[PDB]
């Protein structure tokens, strides 16, 4: 109650400024824009005690993965850190991203007190699995995936812990990239500290932390006030995955959401964990459920822990797909299990909120991680993020869904590489990066169509996918989306310079390509909204002529039939609309 409102807004806005400063430090140097996994990071400010005070949540893969991140990092180092130190980790012990996402932690000291932590993550090129992607389908003795890093100091009171930094430099296929990117993490964390120290100087911890507690309360009350306006009761969602574990079908994520007025409690109930890198751990599943929430409430605002003070989560017993402990020793996929998890949670929350039901996205389905010995006599490696960029922003009561949206597991902040940006940087021909026909949704509002990435190696190239869910696509739209006849993704290889056509169920083995041979993967599009017989007639005609839906499509999906004729045949239009 002694929190001055003017100075409250000033404090929060200054924090927003520092967040942008750090995010830009990484944005233009980190190589995680079109070469490392694009925008697979979020920088965040955490409290004296491990509570997140502000996240500029740009990508939600770091939505609930950061809250119980500081718990174990800061709590395992009780008193024994000091000004100038950094802790570094990526491991999913009780937290953490897929272990290619590693991150640096710096605590801020002020005249002898610990005031807040700065956290700087970024997606790295390699982590040291037998597979250059780090995304390794052979998950025997799950230690096959790569190098796991518990809390280890890589800076100590202002100096490099060279002893260990060189332990981490090896076991990784990139060296200088890794090195520069850790340099950029230290830089970003340093400016994050400098501005905030300026804040403590202008205000004093007595003011900054008072206003911060107030902001946590503001987030808490905001989320609780929203929850007051949805009915109390027990709701559930259930959605499946089948193209998993050599394509073996498996049971669903059962997301029960129990809402009592101000608060909601979330149970998960997943099937048993697997010998595949799509196992999930604590922070991963937490981000999944939080994404279930965010997909229909709101994208924009600034974020902190307060938001989730009335959202309690319970993933179920350890050793299952959603909550693993050491019994599944590794995970590279915060993509495969999490998509189904997020769908289920959102389906529950929308079962409570018919007001805000949206259509499902394509999951992104589509990775292709490629590179090898170039024309430059070195190692050149990347994930073809392009292969997995765009499905379609589902479809809403008032939206066709943009086919320019990112991860498709996720809000969409991901950014594809441009062609020339890639053909100089990589020894390939990017043969096609075009958009699909009859790959999006079917409804009163259809979904966007996805990508066709057709890639050709110039001298030698390897191809790694392993990713699941490409034939049985549970992307179904809003209870009336039809999906009468549509193409999913196929991981296809044309080899031997003859019409190879080795069609792979997306869980691809390590493939290779010779000059002239082509690897193709496509991005399955988003769902549909409602009944497509109600999609505007001129709109369906345009959409067919636009070259995203064929006549063969239109006749069966929308009940708008075109012929080798001008407009649409008055009667052929309605003859097919019995249902």
């Amino acid at each position: 109650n002694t929190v001055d409102p003017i100075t409250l807004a000033v404090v929060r806005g200054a924090l927003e400024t520092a967040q942008r400063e750090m995010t830009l430090t990484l944005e233009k140097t980190s190589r995680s824009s079109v070469f490392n996994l694009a925008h697979d990071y979020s920088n965040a400010l955490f409290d004296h005690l491990p509570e997140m005070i502000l996240q500029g949540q740009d990508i939600p893969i770091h939505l609930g993965s950061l809250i119980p991140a500081m718990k174990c990092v800061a709590g395992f180092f009780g008193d024994e850190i000091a000004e100038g130190d950094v802790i570094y980790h990526n491991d999913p012990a009780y937290m953490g991203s897929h272990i290619l996402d590693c991150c640096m932690y710096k605590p801020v000291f002020y005249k002898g007190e610990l005031v807040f932590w700065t956290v700087c993550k970024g997606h790295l090129t390699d982590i040291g699995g037998p597979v250059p992607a780090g995304y390794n389908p052979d998950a025997k003795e799950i230690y096959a995936e790569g190098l796991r890093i518990p809390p280890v100091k890589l800076w100590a009171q202002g100096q490099r812990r060279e002893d260990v930094i060189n332990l981490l430099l090896t076991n990784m296929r990139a060296r200088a990239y890794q090195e520069g990117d850790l340099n950029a993490q230290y830089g970003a964390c340093s400016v994050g500290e400098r501005h905030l120290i300026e804040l403590l100087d202008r205000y004093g911890v007595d003011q900054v932390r008072a206003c911060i507690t107030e902001l946590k309360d503001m987030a808490d009350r905001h989320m609780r006030a929203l929850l007051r306006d949805v009915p109390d009761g027990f709701y559930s969602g259930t959605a499946i995955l089948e193209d998993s574990g050599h394509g073996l079908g498996e049971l669903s994520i059962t997301a029960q959401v129990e809402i009592r007025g101000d608060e909601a409690h979330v149970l998960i109930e997943s099937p048993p964990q697997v010998p595949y890198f799509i196992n999930s751990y604590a922070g991963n599943s937490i981000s999944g459920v939080y994404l279930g929430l965010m997909m229909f409430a709101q994208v924009p605002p600034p974020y902190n822990e307060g938001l989730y003070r009335c959202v309690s989560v319970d993933l179920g017993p350890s050793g299952t797909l959603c909550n693993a402990q050491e019994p599944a020793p590794h995970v590279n996929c915060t993509t495969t299990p999490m998509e189904t998890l997020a769908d289920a949670v959102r389906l529950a929350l929308e079962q409570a909120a018919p007001e805000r039901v949206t259509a499902s996205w394509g999951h992104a389905s589509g990775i292709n991680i490629a590179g090898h010995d170039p024309r430059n006599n070195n190692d050149e490696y990347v994930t073809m993020v392009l292969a997995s960029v765009i499905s379609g922003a589902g479809a809403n009561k008032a939206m066709d869904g943009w086919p320019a949206c990112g991860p498709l597991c996720c809000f969409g902040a991901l950014m594809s590489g441009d062609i020339e940006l890639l053909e100089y940087s990589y020894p390939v021909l990017i043969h096609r990066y075009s958009l699909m026909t009859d790959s999006g949704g079917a409804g009163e509002f259809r979904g966007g169509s996805g990508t066709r990435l057709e890639l050709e190696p110039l001298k030698h190239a390897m191809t790694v996918v392993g990713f699941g869910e490409g034939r049985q696509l549970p992307t179904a739209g809003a209870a009336g989306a039809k999906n009468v006849l549509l193409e999913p993704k196929l991981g296809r290889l044309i080899h031997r310079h003859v019409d190879g056509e080795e069609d792979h169920y997306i869980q691809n083995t390590l493939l290779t390509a010779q000059p002239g041979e082509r690897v193709i993967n496509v991005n399955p599009g988003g769902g549909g909204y409602g009944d497509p017989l109600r999609r505007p007639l001129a709109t369906v005609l345009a959409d067919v002529r636009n070259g995203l839906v064929s006549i063969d499509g239109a006749r069966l999906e929308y009940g708008v039939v075109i012929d080798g004729n001008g407009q649409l045949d008055e009667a052929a239009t309605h003859a097919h609309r019995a249902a």
């Binding site: 409102p5 003017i6 807004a9 233009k28 090195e179 230290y186 943009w402």
Partner: protein, 691 residues
């Protein structure tokens, strides 16, 4: 001998001057739908200054400089040219891809509906040919697709053709054959080409620029037909000149017509104007903050190359053509005191404007504004901002600040009044950062230059947070947007690409030098056909843009001597290293390998303009302290009787007393405590902490 036209969209700024250097200002607002009103309805009034014939007197002007951004309006009005696209097979719809996502953060929503298309896949004609990263023709140009697409373009009534091919920036023969095929099909059809608009890397940006230029260029064509006719029929001796976003006057009478370099230029002269205001004071690096009740426009001149920009994104369309980097952030004077239902006093998102007006104006004003808090602080009394029906109400602002901001926030009327303004000033600080820190270093070295309208109410406060020692206020409020375009000389930006490594390999000196001197020849030819100043000295400053291996975004490097070799090659990297250092952290260099792009901008310094200046009799400034006003500056909390001065009768600058407000018939200047100000002969108030 000079006329300048600054169509600002609210009024029209008409700038007229002769050998007196007198900044004679006229107004003539024009309908958004046709601009011939400014010319013919302004020239009648310039006849009224001496009593000379308005048809005769334009003949006495050696320059008619018209900055207008009707191309921006064309992008806005959903009005343009039905554009055909010639594109490379497999990448025909990349324009619609827009690199995945880039949209969350600048304009935002829950259900962002971005990217209304300029090409709808009806005009997305692919051509089967393909080349690669070194200029090798992997597959030849598909002339069949081109012919069929031309017939189809005739079918769909296409009006302009944009062409953007893969990797043509290093082997443009494919685009050249296609453009030849179109122009040689003998259609009355303007044709753009990638290598002839923005020949650099990142195809999406090149294609977007090409398609926008196809969308707009012939609109500017018709405009130049009408306006060249207007001015040459009104008696102008010299070719007409038009103000660009590069700071110079090319269009209409040159060998290159391109609207993409005319999009939202308008008041991009702001730094050119800032230096023309500040240079008699000896300030090297300056920042202008021009604002009205509409928005805030912030820009530097030098230091980090804030002088220019990167691949800009105009409104939803990615335009790469080099422009001066400025920041337009939010609503300024007539902005609303927004207070959300989330407990956050986020004053400043949306402009009340003049139409509902501030609560001051009473024309429908409900929400308190920056004007409303400004009056609540005692900065305005009777009405001294704009030339019309002003209708100054006062207490409604105080009570509205109370009940709409102060009362619900649990803060007093005085606190909310000061706080609205605090948050606005901090927003201006943030805008300053977007170009000062993000492109360089501590603004402590620069002078702010306020001008126009509401700037005088927040510059000082803003300077106090920015750290500027010197604040400059042109006494002629409209002087900034006038000087910066009137003193515009000839400026040609000529660019190209050259992937070449400076480290890890021996630089091919002959090749790098060749590309640099060829850009010089391109500049020489640009002036050859625009008009080369007679034994007039011109300058080409080189810029090389390089990066560390594996990064995406480069950094700029200045190049002074006109040819380059080893004894200055290594220092080149030094220029880069510190530069990268200055933007990111304190020690980067291990292998600053890759160079990407090369640029030379030729400047023909042709202006020989007159400027007004004063002289002084004595030391009195006796009768300026025009009464007193109860004023609250946030630093007192007692409302001292702070003095009010009449800015129009102030004798040649004598040192001013402490905290005060200077009101002129035109505008209003704050002077917070601790500052000392005098009116320099150059018609600029110098404000400096002399206390």
């Amino acid at each position: 001998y000079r006329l300048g036209i600054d169509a600002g969209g609210t009024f029209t700024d008409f700038i007229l001057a002769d050998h007196q250097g007198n900044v004679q200002l006229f107004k003539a607002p024009s309908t958004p739908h046709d601009g011939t009103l400014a010319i013919r309805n302004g020239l009648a009034q310039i006849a009224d200054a001496l009593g000379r014939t308005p048809a005769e007197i334009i003949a006495d002007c050696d320059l008619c400089i018209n900055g207008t951004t009707v191309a921006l309006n064309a992008l806005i009005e959903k009005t343009g040219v039905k554009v055909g696209l010639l594109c490379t097979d497999g990448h025909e719809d990349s324009l619609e891809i827009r690199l995945g996502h880039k949209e969350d953060g600048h304009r935002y929503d829950a259900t962002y509906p971005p990217a209304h298309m300029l090409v709808p896949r009806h005009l997305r004609r692919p051509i089967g040919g393909r080349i690669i990263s070194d200029g090798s023709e992997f597959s030849p140009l598909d002339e069949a697709a081109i012919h069929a697409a031309i017939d189809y373009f005739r079918e769909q009534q296409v009006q302009a053709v944009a062409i953007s091919f893969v990797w043509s920036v290093r082997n443009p023969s494919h685009e050249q054959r296609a453009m030849a095929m179109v122009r040689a099909a003998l259609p009355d059809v303007f044709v753009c080409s990638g290598h002839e608009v923005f020949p650099q890397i990142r195809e999406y940006t090149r294609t977007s620029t090409t398609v926008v230029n196809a969308y707009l260029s012939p609109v500017m064509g018709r405009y130049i037909e009408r306006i060249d006719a207007l001015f040459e029929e009104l008696g102008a001796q010299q070719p007409t000149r038009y103000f660009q976003s590069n700071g110079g006057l090319a269009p209409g009478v040159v060998m290159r017509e391109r609207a993409v370099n005319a999009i939202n230029s308008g008041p991009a002269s702001a730094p050119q104007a800032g230096l023309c205001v500040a240079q008699p004071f000896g300030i090297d690096n300056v920042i202008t903050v021009d604002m009205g009740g509409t928005s805030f426009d912030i820009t530097l001149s030098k230091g980090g190359r804030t002088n220019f920009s990167k691949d800009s994104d105009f409104l939803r369309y990615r335009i790469g053509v080099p422009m001066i980097q400025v920041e337009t952030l939010g609503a300024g004077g007539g902005s609303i005191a927004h207070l959300d239902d989330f407990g956050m006093l986020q004053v400043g998102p949306r402009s009340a404007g003049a139409n509902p007006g501030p609560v001051c104006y009473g024309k429908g004003g409900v929400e308190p504004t920056v004007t409303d808090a400004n009056l609540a602080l005692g900065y305005l009394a009777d009405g001294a901002l704009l030339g019309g029906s002003i209708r100054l109400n006062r207490q409604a602002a105080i009570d509205a600040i109370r009940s709409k901001i102060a009362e619900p926030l649990g803060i007093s009327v005085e606190r909310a009044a000061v706080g609205i303004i605090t948050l606005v000033n901090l927003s201006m600080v943030s805008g300053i950062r977007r170009v000062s820190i993000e492109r360089g270093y501590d603004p402590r070295d620069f002078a702010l230059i306020g001008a126009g309208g509401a700037a005088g109410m927040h510059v000082m406060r803003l300077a106090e947070e920015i750290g500027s020692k010197v604040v400059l206020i042109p006494k002629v409020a409209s002087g900034l947007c006038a000087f910066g375009q009137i003193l515009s000389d000839i400026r040609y930006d000529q660019l190209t690409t050259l992937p070449m490594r400076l480290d890890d390999e021996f630089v091919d000196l002959e090749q790098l030098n060749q590309a640099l001197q060829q850009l010089r020849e391109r500049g020489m030819t640009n002036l050859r056909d625009d008009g080369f100043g007679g034994d007039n000295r011109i300058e080409c400053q080189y810029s090389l843009e390089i990066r560390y291996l594996g990064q995406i975004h480069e950094c700029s490097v200045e190049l002074s001597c006109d040819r380059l070799d080893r004894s200055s090659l290594a220092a080149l990297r030094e220029s880069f290293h510190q530069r990268h250092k200055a933007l990111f952290s304190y020690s980067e260099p291990n292998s600053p390998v890759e160079l990407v792009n090369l640029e030379c901008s030729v400047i023909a310094r042709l202006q020989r303009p007159p400027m007004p200046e004063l002289a002084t009799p004595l030391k009195a400034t006796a009768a300026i302290p025009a009464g007193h006003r109860p004023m609250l500056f946030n630093a007192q909390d007692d409302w001292q009787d702070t003095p009010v001065y009449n800015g129009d009768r102030i004798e040649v600058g004598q040192i001013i007393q402490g905290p005060c407000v200077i009101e002129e018939a035109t505008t209003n200047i704050l002077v917070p405590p601790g500052w000392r100000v005098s009116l320099d002969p150059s018609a600029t108030y110098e404000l400096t902490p002399g206390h």
